[PDB]
Amino acid sequence: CVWEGNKLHC
């Protein structure tokens, strides 16, 4: 996963 601000994308 990666952080894109206030939320995590997996």
Range 1-10 burial, b when 16+ CB lie within 10 A, else e: eeeeeeeeee
Question: How far apart are the C-alpha atoms of 10 and 4, rounded to whole Å?
Answer: 11
Please give the sequence-ordered ranges of beta strands (E in DSSP) within 1-10, or none if there are none: 2-3, 8-9
From CA 8, how far away is CA 6, in angstroms rounded? 7
